[model samples]
Target chain A: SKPFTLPILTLGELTNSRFPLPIDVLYTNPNESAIVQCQNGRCTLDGELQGTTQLLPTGICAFRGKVTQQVQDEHRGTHWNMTVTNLNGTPFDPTEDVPAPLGTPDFSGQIYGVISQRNTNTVPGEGNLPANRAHEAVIATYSPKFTPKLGNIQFSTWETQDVSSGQPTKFTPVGLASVDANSHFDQWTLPSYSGALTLNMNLAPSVAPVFPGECLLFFRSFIPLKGGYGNPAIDCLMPQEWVQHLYQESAPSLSDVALVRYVNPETGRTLFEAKLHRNGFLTVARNSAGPVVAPTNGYFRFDSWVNQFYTLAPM
Target chain B: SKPFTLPILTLGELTNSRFPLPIDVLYTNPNESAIVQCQNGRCTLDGELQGTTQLLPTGICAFRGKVTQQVQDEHRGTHWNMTVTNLNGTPFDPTEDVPAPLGTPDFSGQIYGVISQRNTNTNLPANRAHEAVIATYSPKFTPKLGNIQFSTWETQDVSSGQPTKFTPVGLASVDANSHFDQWTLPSYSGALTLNMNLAPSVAPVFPGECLLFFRSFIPLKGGYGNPAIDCLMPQEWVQHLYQESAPSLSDVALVRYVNPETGRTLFEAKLHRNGFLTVARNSAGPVVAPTNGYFRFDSWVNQFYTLAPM
Candidate 1:
C-alpha cells in the first residue's frame, strides 16, 4: 500500500563502502589495464551489469573487471568506464591529488570475455588499450589469501611465438620452466630458434590480488613484435592463485631436455621454467563438464580496452 | 663526455631520466610464490623499473612504481611518470583520444618499454611487482597479405595444481608452429557446466587485421593453488623483427572446428577436432615442454603485454 524511497546518496559518503555492485569493465591490454575506470560520473560495464542493470548508487564503487564489451559508436567497442569515485569521500576532480594510499577498496566478481577486433576499443595514447578489443574469455579461479611472500594472484601468463617451415620443427621455444615437485612430472622447455623467430611475452595477474589490502581486479599485457611467422601474434595472462615460473638462466638437465629455468634480464635471478606438463591442479582442466568447443576463425580478433585508471601527470 | 653546463637544463630535459626503481621482495611460505613487487617508484627484486620505459633519443628513462616486501604491505606502490610529450615535433601522448578509422599504421621506432606489473602496473590495483623484469617486448604482427578468414587465441589451462602430478592438456588439441604461433589456435570444444573447465581463449587481434589471431606466451605461474613455482618470473621484450610463426591455422584444418553453421561457441567454430593436430612448421617439439628441462605444466597464468608494429 505504500511506496518506499531509498536514501539520497552523496559521492563523498560512499568511501570504503562495500555493496554488491558492478563498477566497470576492467579493460586490459598489454600496456594499459583499467581495474577501475570512470569518466563524467558513472561506473559501467562490470561483468555483473552486462544487461539492463540500473545505474545507481553513484560514488566510490568497483566492479569485477571483465574482458567485456561496450557499444562504442556502432561497430566500435570499448572498455570505456565511468566510475563515480568519491575521491576518498572528498570530491571528484581530475586535478585533485586523490591522495596516495588513497584508502579506497576495489570491487569484486569475475567474468572473462574475449577480444574480437583489433584496435577496436583502444583509446590512442593509452598504450595497448585498443589492441585488446578481441573476443576473450574470462575463467574464474579461487582467490587465495595473500601472504607477504605471495602474490594476490596465484596464476600469471605471457605471450610467445615461433615459426619455421619444413617438416615442422619439433617445436619453437620462447623460454623454459623446470622444477622438481611433489609430483613425478616436472618440466617446461621453451623452443630454441633457428630462423627469424618472433616471440613476445607479456604480464598477467595471479589469482592473488594485485592490490594487497584493497580489492581490485588484476589484468596486464605485453608488447607485440613482428617477423614471427610473417604476421605473428600472441596473448597471455597469469592469475595470482597459481604458483608458476618466469625464466631461468641455468637449469638442471632433465635428461635430454635441460630443466626449465628462466633468468630475469632485470635481475640475475633464476625463475623456474613452467613445466607445461606439470602443475596438474593448476594447469589441468577440471572440465567435469567436458572439453570446450573450438573458436571460429572469423571471430579471432583482439583488442585492448582503453580505461585510464590513474593520471600520470608529472609530480 | 663533459657535463654540459647549459644555462638551463631541468630534470625534464635530462636525456636519460632514471628515477628510483623499487621492488618488494616477498618472503613467504617456501611452498608458495613470494610476492616480489616493484611499483610506483620501486625497483624489482632484481633492480629494474616496473612501469613503461620512457625511451628518449638518448636512452630509456624509467620510474619505479611503489614496492612492498610482501603482498601484505599496508603500503601499496605509488607511481610517478614523466612524459616527454613534445618529442622533437611529434606529440607522443599514448593516452590521448584515439583517432577514428583504426588501421595498419607504423607503430614503431621510438624506444619504449611496456610494464604490466602488479599494484602499480596492473590495469587494476596491484599487490607487488616481481623480481623478474625482462627486456620489454612488443607484439607486432601483420596478417598475411593474402586472403585469410579468422584469427584469435585460445587457452585450455587448468586450475593450480602440482605440475609433477598434473598433465597440461589442450582441449582443442592443436599444434603450435612456434610457442608464439599458438595465438591463432581457435577453441575446438565447449563445456556445459559453469566452472567445469576454464581457460583463456578468444580473438586476440583486430578482426579487420584478418579475422582471428591466436597468441600464447611463457607461463609465469602455475599451480598456485598447490605450490609456488617461480617459473618465467620476468617479462621479456621480444623483438618484433625477430618473431615468426611456422604454418598458418588454415593448414591445420579446413572445415572450421566449431561448425559455424550451428550456433556454436567460437570454441566449436574453428576446429575439425583432429584438424590442427599437425600443421605448423615447428610443431615437432613436445606439445608440452618437459617438466624437467622441456616440461609441460597443466595450469594457466596471467599475461599482459601489447601489440605494436615495428
Candidate 2:
C-alpha cells in the first residue's frame, strides 16, 4: 500500500474524514478539556521517549486519549512545539517490548496513541518538486515509536490541581485528548538525504480497537491542495451509522459481525476467519493461517491492520 | 546523562513547565483554536512522519506549533489516536530529509514539532518495574524524527473554512494548538526493550528559535510524585524579562544577548559564541570548531543543542 495525500484549502476543504467531534463533546461530561502552562518555553508532557542518538533525543509520545500539559502562549499567542520533556515518568524500554518497524510495542506501557512514519520516500533531487508535488506528504501511525508500549490504555483528561490557587494549579489528569503540531524546515535532510521531506503523521489506537485504544484528539489539519487551494483530510473507514450501533446495541457474540481476511493464492497464507462486531470488537475463528502474532497482529487494531495488508480479522 | 523520574500526585502535581496558557489567550488574539470532526474515527493531521520498520506505520506528527485537526469524540467522548491517515499528503521522504536518529528533517516542510525517543533503555526483566521505581521516565525532544527537516518552521494559528456551514463548516483550521496524550502500557518493550516508555515527547520549535520554532502546546502533564502523588513539568529555560525584551526591544545585535555555551577540558567543544537573547532567539559567533553539521547542529535550536551534552 503506497502513501497518499490530500491538498486542503486554507479557505475551506476537508479530506476523506471529519474530525474533532463536537465542541460539546470536547468540553462536556465523560469527555474533558484543560490547559497546562509553560514556565518558560518547555512543557512537561506525560509521555515516554525513544531513540538513543544525536538526532533523536526527545522521543514521540504514546497518548492515552487524554492530554496532560500544553505550552503557555501569552505573548507568542498560543504557539506550538513547546520543547517538551518527560513528566519524569518511566520511559519506554525497547528490550521488553520492542517498537514495531523495530519490534512489538509494550502494549502494557500503552496499547494505543502511537505515531510514526511507515515508509519514507527517498531524498529529493536538485531543487524542489513540481508545485503540484512540491510537498508530497502522506501519513501512517503506530500510536508511538522510537516508541513505547501502551497497556490497557484508558481514556483520561488532565486537570490542574487547585489545591492552592496562590501557587499554580497542579496537573490532574481527567479525560479527553487535544493535540496539534506544525513545523517548517529550510533544510529537511541529513548527510545526503537532501530535499524536502514527505512528512508522514501516522497514528495507532489502543489494542482494543475501542475508545481506550482508538480515539484521538480533534485536530483540524489543512494543507495546500495543489496550490494551497482545496485539500481534504483523512476520515474514518468505519461508518457513523455503525459506530452508533455499539452504544445502541449490546454484546458481540450475539451481534452480527463482518468478515475481513486475506488469502494469498500463491503463498497459501490465509487471514482470520474474522469478525468486526458492532461493538467495534475484533475476533478470529479457530481455523486460519496468518502471521498469527497477537491481537493487533503488529498493527494498531486487528481490523485496521487487516485493512492495511489484509491483516487483523474476526467477525 | 541517564534517565530520571518524578513521582506525581493524582490529586494535582506538575512536573516542570506550565502549559495550555490562558483559555482567553488561546482564543483571544494572535493565538486561536478550533475543532475538526472525525467522519467516523479518522482525522487528517497536518504533519510529517518518519520510520520504515513494521511497528511505525502511522508516523509522528511534525507539528508546526499550530495544530490543524484533532479527533471527534461523540459517544466515546474526546479520545486520542483516531487512527489517523495522511490527508493523502506526501509522506515524509527520509531519503530526502533523513529523520534524525536517522538523519535530518525537512524544515521546508516546517522546522519544528518533531518527536521521538532519544536513548531507550534495554528491555525489562521478568515483570514490570517496581512501584517507587515502578515507572521511571525522562524526556528529550528533537522536535521530530524518524523525522523530517523543518525548514524555516514558523508559528501559525489554523483557521476553518466558512464557505458554507451547511456542510458542517467545512474545516477552517483556526489558529492555535492543543495536544494531549495518555497511555498505560502493561508493557513498554519490544524484541528486548521492556518496562514503560521513557516517554520522551521532545519538541523542536522552528529553526529560527522563535514562535515559528519553540512555543509548544500548553500541556498539563501530571504523574505520581511518589504514590499517586505530585509531579512537575518541563518549562522554558529563558527568563520572562528577556522574553519580553524581544517583542519590546528590537533586533538581535542590539538586544543585550545572553551567553550560553559549552567548554570542555579536553574536547574543547566550546559552544555558541552563544546568545540566548531576550526575544527567544539563538545565534553563535561566526567561527567555531563544533560538529558543524547544519543549522541546528543536529539538535532542535542551535543554542539549546549546546545545552544538552554536558
Candidate 3:
C-alpha cells in the first residue's frame, strides 16, 4: 500500500425501492463502463481515478455487480484492470484471423435487447447510504496488507480459448502469478463462500466460427439487494409501482443477457476481447459510492453453469 | 382465456427455475431489427401507445418489450386477439436538445464506449476457477403502467410520473385511450388483463447518464474454491501462489431499476393522463404458470420507482 493515495469515487444517483417489489435504480456511469484492469492498482473510475498510481497493470481492476474478481494477496489475478483494451480495433488488426465474428451490432444489439428484461437493485438499495459503499478506488501500489484464501471456494483457476478469426488472442495468465503483491499489505479471514459464476458466449473461434451475432460477453456481480435471487420481491417495494410492474412483468427482459468484456493492451488481458459500435456506454452504479449495504444472512445465488461448445460444429 | 387462438402462445425457449429468475426471452429477426407501426390497432413507440385488442401486437412480436404509456381495461373482458408490430432502433442518435442540466451528452459527448470484452468462460484464478472474467452490453427500457384517478380510491389514487429522455427513447405500451388500463383490469381477480408485453432491446441503460461508472464495476462472478470468506482463516481450500483468500464469484452488474415517474412523457399527466408507460412484459417461471409471483408488488414494495428513459 505504498504509492498511497486513492479515494474519491462518486457516481451514485439511480436509487429507488418500494418494498418487496417495484425496484429500480438505473443511473450507471462506471468510470465510463468496461473496466477490469490490473498491474496491481487500477480502479478509481472518475472523481479522477482518485490519488492515481499509474493503474492499468499489476492485476488491473474494474468488474462489478457483487464487486467481483479481486481479493488478491497471494498473487492470482489478471484482465488488465478496468479493461478497455480495443474498444473496436485500431492496432488489433490481425489479418490472418481474429476479426471475423460479426452480426450482433445495432447498439451492442440494443444492449443485449435491453439488459435482458428487468431486475436489479438490492444491497438494501444501499441501506443507510450517504456515500462509501465498500470504498474501492485501488491501484496505489495496492496491497493494503492483503490476506484472503481460507475455506469453501470451489472452481475456476483461469482458462480461456477463443479469439481466432484468424488468430492473436493469446493472454495466458496462469496461477500464483506475482505473489506478496506490494508486500505486507494484509487483511483477514475467509468463510463459507461459494462458486459458480459461469457464463458462455461464442463467435470468434473461426475457421468459420459462425459470427451470426459475434457476442461473447461478461460482467456480473452486484446483487447487493441481500438475499438469494438477488432479492427484490415484495412487489419491488414501490419504485413507482416498480415502474409499472416493470412494464407489466413481460418476464425480466434485459436482452437475454451478454456483456462482452474488453481491455487487452498487449497482454495485460481482460480478454474475450471487444471494441465495437460504441453507443451510450456508461457502466456501474447501484448507489455508486455511498451507503451500499445489504448482505445480512447471505444467499445471493445464480446457478446456470451449463456447458457444450463443440461438435454442433457450426460449419 | 380464449380469444381465437390465444392458445398458440408458442413463443417457446423459456424454462422456469420455479420463479426466482428466467422468463425474459426474445429472438427477433424482422429484417434484422427496426420496425414500428401498429396503426389502426394502435402502436406508436417514442410517442407511446399500444393496442391490438388483447395483445400479440406484432413481429419479434412487436418490439418484444413494450409498456410505453399507461391506462387500460376499457372493459376487455373484450379479448379480440391476433396482432404484430416489430420495431427496432439502437442507432441511438439522441442529442436534438436537452443537454446541460447534467443529462450530459453535449453532442455525442456521452454514449460512453467499449462494447466488447470477453473470456466468457473458464478462468477465475482466485480460489482456482479461471476468474479471468470481463463482460458488458447496453441499451434499455421500461415503464409498464401507472394512472390512478378514477372512482376515488384514495384521494384520487395518484401515482404517475416516470418516463423521460426528451430527444427520443421509449417502449412498453397500451393505447386507444386505454382508460387507465381497463380501469385496472377489473381489479385483476375478475380476470380482465388487457395487454402489455414487450422485450426488444434487452435494456442495459448506463452509457451516458454516467451513474459513477456503475459504482466502480467489478467482474469475477467465478472463482469459488474457498468460501466462508475463506473459512474464518485456515488457508486450505485450494492452495496456490497469489493468495487473497479465494472464493470469488461476482456478477453484480444488474439492470431494470426504473422509477422515472417524474415528467417528460408529455409532462407527467397525473399518472400519465391515460397512457405513457402501461404494463405487460409478463413472467412467472421459477416453478411454472406464473409462480413465485409479484406482478406489481405494490409499486415495488414502496419506493414508488424511477429511472426509465433509454
Candidate 4:
C-alpha cells in the first residue's frame, strides 16, 4: 500500500428537521472510520471494488451523516446540501472515466461525506421558506427495475393545501420540482389562522425513463396554525427494493386521505405509523401517544426513526 | 329601391346524432315569416326598422331559424351557424357603410351571421383536421389553453371515434370561432404510450359580477363526415346567464344541468343555493324538448333549437 492522501471527505449540508431523535451522528458506525476511501483515483467502501460491494470508483462521493444532538424543544431542525460537481465546481459525470461500479452502482449506490459547513446552509434564492417553522418532512418514492443514476434522479411534486375554513386550494408555485441535486427537503412557516389544516404532496418523476409504477413515502407535520407549537418533523432514507410494493396509483383524488407507515428495511418490522385526514385537519398516532385533537396552539411532532410523538404547547 | 334579392337563406349545416329529434323547424312563429329582412342596405327582424331593433345592419343577417318541427321523444336538438362575410367570400366585418353593429361590437359585444358559406365549412389548412388529429386533454380542473371565449360563434366541428370500442373516445376538429380566430379545439385519435400529452386551445375578457364562475355547453354531432358516426362536433349559443344565481356561494363542486322540465331550473334553484346542483334551460314547456345525455349516436341531422342532451 502506498501513502496517498484521500481528500478530507465531508458530507454535503445535513438538514435534520426530524428533531428530538438524535443530534448528528455518522453514516457508518463511529467505530468504523472512513466510510469512503480512495487511492490514486480508485475507491472502495468495505473493499472488493466490484459487484454490490464497491462504493465510489472516482469522482466525489457523499451520503447522509448520523443523528447529532437531540434538541429539547425546537421549531425545526437544520438542512444542508452541496453540489458534487467536478472539484472545479462544474457538472461532471463520475462514470465518464472509471465506468465500472461507477458505471451503475446497485440499490445503495455510492456514498460520501461533507468536509465544509458553508455547503450546509440553504442555497441562495431559497429564502422564501418559512422560518418560525411549523412542520417539515423528508419524503421520497422510487422504482425498482431501473436504479436511477445519481445524476438522473428527477423528482417533481404537486402540493395542495386545505386552509382551516376555506376550500382546499391548489397552490401553483413557480417551480413544481427542484433542480436535480444529491439531496432535497422542505419546511413550512407562517402566522396563524383558525382551526386545523393539512398539506399533502403528490410526488412523481418529472423527466425521462418513466417506469410502469411508483411508491410514495408520506411524512406528516401535524401541528397548529398559530404560534405555541414548536417544530414537528419526519425523516427517513428508503432503499430501491422497499418501493416495489407501492400500488401504481396516479393522480390522487382531493378526498384521498394519506395513511403512511415505515417498516424496517432489513428486519421487516414496523417502525412508525402515522395518519393525516383528507381535509388535512386531524392526525392520529398508532404507536407512541394515540389519537390527537386540535390544541388551541401547540405541536404534535413525530420522528419515524424514533417512532415517537412529542407534543409541545404554551402556558 | 333596387330589386336586390338577399340570397335564399339556409343554416350553414345540420348534424343530428339525436335521431328521433325533429328534422326541421323555425326560430320564431311560422305564421310570422321572415325572421330577418333586408332592404336597400338596412336589415330588420319582423319590421323593427334600421335602428334599435335592427338585426343585421349590413352583414348577411343569418340567425337561428324557428323550430320547423318537433317530435315527442327527442334526446337533444340541432344547431347551425354561418359567418356573414362580404359576398365575394372573405373575412369582411360588415359595416361597409351602416357601421353600427358590424363595426366591431364592443368588448362584451354583439355579432350576427354569414354573407358567404366559404367562411362557414372550415378555414383553409383546416382540411387536415379530419384525417390527422394530434393533441389531447389531460382532463385538467379548469383554466388551460387560454380560458375560451363565451360569445364567439363557431359553426364547425369534426368528431372521431374508437373503432375498437365503438364509443366516441375523443374529438378532433377545427373552429368556426371566426376568420380572425387564433385558437382551435382538438382531441387525440391514437393508442397510448408514456411521457407525452399535449392540449391546445384559444383564449378571452370579462365584466364585473365576479363569483368565480364558468359555463359550458356541448352540442353534439349534427353533421356527416368520411365514415358513420364519424364527424365530431361542438357548437352552441349558450348565454352566461344560465351560470347565474350559481349559489352566490360561488365555488361549485360540479353542476351538471340535465333535466326535462322547464320549471326544473327554478325548482332546483334552492338546490343550487345550497351550494351545488342547478339546471337552466329554455322557458318553453318540455313537449318536444328534452334534457340530453352527454353522448349520442346518429347519422344526419339539422339545427333549429335542438337542445337535446348533447
Regions of model 2 farther than 4 Å from truth:
A1-255, A262-270, A286-291, A294-315, B1-94, B97-217, B220-310
RMSD of each: 29.7, 27.1, 27.5, 31.1
- Residue-by-residue lDDT tens digits, candidate 2, B218-281: 2211211100100011111111111122221111112111122432221112111112211223
Q: Which runs in model 1 stand beyond 4 Å of their true positions?
A: A1-315, B1-310
Better of 1 and 2 by lDDT: 2
What is the model-wide C-alpha lDDT for candidate 2? 0.19
lDDT of 2 by residue, A215-313 (tens): 212212221111122222211222111221221222223223334343333344553244343323333433322223322211111222223123332
Candidate 4 lDDT for residue A142: 21
In angstroms, the error of model 2 at B233 is 26
Q: Where does candidate 4 stray beyond 4 Å?
A: A1-186, A189-315, B1-187, B190-266, B269-280, B283-310
Taking chain B only, the TM-score of every model is 0.17, 0.18, 0.14, 0.17
Q: Positional deviation of B285 in candidate 4, in angstroms?
A: 18
The local distance difference test score of each candidate is 0.17, 0.19, 0.17, 0.18
Give the lDDT of residue A265 in candidate 1: 35
TM-score, predicted candidate 2 vs. hidden true structure = 0.21
Q: Give the TM-score (vs. native) of candidate 1.
A: 0.16
**Which rank order by TM-score, best down to worst?**
2, 3, 4, 1
Please report how far candidate 3 places residue A136 from its true position, in Å. 3.5
Off by over 4 Å in 3: A1-72, A75-134, A137-315, B1-96, B99-102, B105-310
Model 4 interface RMSD, one decimal: 35.3
In Å, residue A45's CA in model 3 sits off its true spot by 36
